[PDB]
Amino acid sequence: ADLTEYLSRHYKAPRMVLAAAGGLEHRQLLDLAQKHFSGLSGTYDEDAVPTLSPCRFTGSQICHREDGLPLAHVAIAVEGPGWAHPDNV
Amino acid sequence: AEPEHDHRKRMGLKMLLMMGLLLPLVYAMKRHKWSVLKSRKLAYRPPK
Question: Which of A44, A48, A86, B29 lies at a C-alpha separation of 20 to 30 Å from B13?
Answer without folding.
Answer: B29
